[PDB]
């Protein structure tokens, strides 16, 4: 009944991370020690009000 | 001449007939002594390697849990 909206191809498309697993993982460690002000920022958001598609910025 | 039949100067030596089972003098309870001691052995380094393998598992969720943003 309700018609769904998606936003526009355009409005993904942002970047890339392009690394195997392995790399990814120690790196990983480290940038999680590092990073982490943003990302767990984005987890209280696409936690609090899930809906991705919402908070995809 | 001399006669042929066999025996010889008398006795051949001794024999011995008599049964002989002897020697093992390693048991006592102490067999188990070493046995548990054995197990008492084997719980304190598996328990090490245990506590390792732990400390292990806590850093590979750490590398996952970093991971998932």
């Known amino acids: ?3 769904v ?5 355009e409005d993904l498309k942002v970047q890339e991370v392009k690394v ?3 790399v990814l993982k120690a790196a990983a460690h480290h940038y999680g ?4 002000k943003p990302n767990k920022e984005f987890m209280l958001c696409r936690w ?4 991705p598609r919402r908070c995809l910025e | 001449k001399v006669k042929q ?3 010889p100067v008398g006795g051949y030596g001794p024999i011995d007939y008599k ?3 002897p020697r093992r003098g390693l048991s006592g309870y102490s067999m188990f002594a070493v046995g548990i001691g054995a197990l008492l052995f084997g719980y304190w380094s598996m328990m090490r390697w245990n506590r390792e393998r732990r400390r292990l598992q806590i850093e590979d969720f750490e590398a996952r849990i970093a991971l998932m943003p």
């Open chain 2, 5 to 7: 039949d066999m025996p």
């Open chain 1, 20 to 22: 195997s697993s392995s």
């Open chain 1, 5 to 9: 909206e998606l936003p526009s191809l």
């Open chain 1, 33 to 36: 020690a590092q990073c982490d």
């Open chain 1, 48 to 51: 609090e009000e899930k809906d």
């Open chain 1, 1 to 3: 009944p309700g018609i």
């Open chain 2, 19 to 21: 049964r002989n089972l």
